[PDB]
């Protein structure tokens, strides 16, 4: 693998992909939150469920995307996914606040994004062997910057037009992504049998449960208990900014650690995440809460950026796609289950402390689980003792 030269343009295209997808998701969610700000309607419960459904479909459809990628190729599947996403996002505008919006913006957009996403992770493997960590770090950092820039691009740099045309405007991004997908030049049911991969995937899935609770409830908590604050947009901006640097440095360092020993980084990350999450209620002064948010954002990147390189390490290149597909499919449920459970706890108790207390446990349990992943040599010793 060149691990250089041309590969950079592929990295650029993948950055564009991720930035468009997650950027859109978050922007549309914020827009809906803004429409419900002053009016009961403009359906509330279903409106909230719509975004969750769209986000979930990305994780839920990964295995079938894996099959299609393996049997057709990264380029064709990526192009088809981009085309479907564009069609869905364009037609959603025609649907004027009707249940048709449910169907289109959920099914069409989610399935399109799911088709487009996984190849954006697989293709990099073909072009990087001794620097894949740095490439993934760069892709994540670029995508994060793109997402953080998207709302500035929409709200203030434009959006002089009524709300109905916002989807139409957003469509062009997916069209451009469809064009970019043509650059994925191809250079060249059984994965679960491996004990190591099974354990790792199960641990990650278990940790994933208490993941979105901070992002979804921090603002409400701060407003509830720190109304004296002028504005609380600072925390989210700071978390994103630190997450960018965390992702980049994590990708750069991951290549240093050889072999499976990379997993120890994830272990530490999880531990820190759990502790900080449990620590938010304690800190009773904003001056400390901001620092805790800083550290949370810093650990988030160290966690996210590493999953793909570890997968390639565990299963090799010829099976990375299927492993990633199954791993994402296994994360479908807990991520959705998290925030609603936190909300139920908040209703049951009233104070918001118990929500974060609960949210802090799953990552610790995940760290403990990952701590016991056997090494290859020990697998061989097991086999020997089997004979």
């Amino acid at each position, epitope marked *: 693998p060149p691990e250089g030269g041309f590969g950079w343009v592929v990295v650029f295209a993948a950055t564009w992909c991720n930035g468009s997808i997650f950027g859109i998701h978050n922007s549309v969610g914020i827009l809906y939150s803004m429409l419900l700000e002053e009016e009961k309607e403009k359906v509330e419960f279903q409106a909230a469920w719509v975004g969750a459904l769209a986000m979930g479909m990305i994780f839920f459809c990964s295995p079938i995307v894996s099959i299609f990628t393996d049997r057709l190729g990264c380029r064709i599947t990526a192009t088809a996914g981009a085309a479907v996403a564009f069609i869905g996002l364009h037609t959603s505008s025609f649907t004027s606040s009707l249940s048709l919006r449910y169907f289109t913006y959920g099914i069409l957009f989610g399935c399109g994004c799911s088709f487009a996403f996984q190849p954006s992770l697989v293709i990099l493997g073909h072009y990087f062997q001794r620097r894949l960590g740095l490439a993934n770090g760069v892709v994540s950092a670029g995508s994060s910057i793109f997402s953080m820039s998207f709302p500035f691009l929409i709200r203030m740099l434009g959006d002089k037009i009524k709300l109905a045309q916002t989807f139409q405007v957003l469509s062009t991004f997916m069209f451009v992504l469809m064009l970019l997908s043509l650059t994925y030049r191809p250079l060249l049911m059984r994965v679960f049998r491996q004990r190591t991969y099974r354990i790792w995937a199960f641990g990650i899935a278990a940790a994933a449960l208490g993941y979105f609770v901070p992002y979804v409830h921090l603002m409400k908590y701060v407003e509830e208990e720190f109304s004296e604050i002028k504005e609380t947009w600072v925390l989210l901006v700071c978390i994103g900014a630190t997450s960018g640097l965390g992702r980049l440095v994590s990708g750069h360092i991951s290549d240093s650690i050889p072999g499976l020993k990379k997993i120890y980084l994830q272990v530490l990350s999880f531990l820190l995440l759990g502790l900080m999450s449990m620590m938010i209620p304690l800190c009773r002064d904003f001056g400390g809460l901001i620092v805790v948010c800083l550290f949370l954002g810093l650990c988030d990147g160290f966690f996210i950026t590493i999953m793909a390189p570890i997968a390639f390490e565990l299963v090799g290149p010829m099976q990375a796609s299927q492993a990633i597909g199954y791993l994402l499919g296994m994360m479908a449920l807990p991520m959705i289950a998290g925030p609603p459970i936190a909300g139920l706890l908040r209703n049951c108790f009233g104070d918001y402390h118990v929500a974060f207390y609960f949210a802090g446990v799953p990552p610790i349990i995940g760290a403990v689980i990952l701590f016991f992943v056997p*090494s*290859r*040599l*020990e697998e*061989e*010793l*097991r086999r*020997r*003792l089997t*004979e």
Partner: nanobody
Amino acid sequence: VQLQESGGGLVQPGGSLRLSCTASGVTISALNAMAMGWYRQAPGERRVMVAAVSERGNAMYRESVQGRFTVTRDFTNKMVSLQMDNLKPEDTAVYYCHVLEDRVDSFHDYWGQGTQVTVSS
């Protein structure tokens, strides 16, 4: 890799016996990349691993002989000591020092000059 088993002989039932040898023809650094262990072979049996210590320092046993068998590893001195207690007649066999070395998508299993051990009254 060179090995020379020290210890063995006849023991009474319920007795104790300690085997140990120093890795030869291998450096400390190389050894730490290897798993030290032992092999059992009774008359007519095939040589089979019974105990070993991992790269990560973990000890692992064949559960049948666990407890009655014990292994400890001193990486500095390149020493692995196979302690055994509560010996029984079924344990009679020749035991061989072994080193497992990892290689590129492959492994190398080395053998020592085994020592006979018998358990009878």
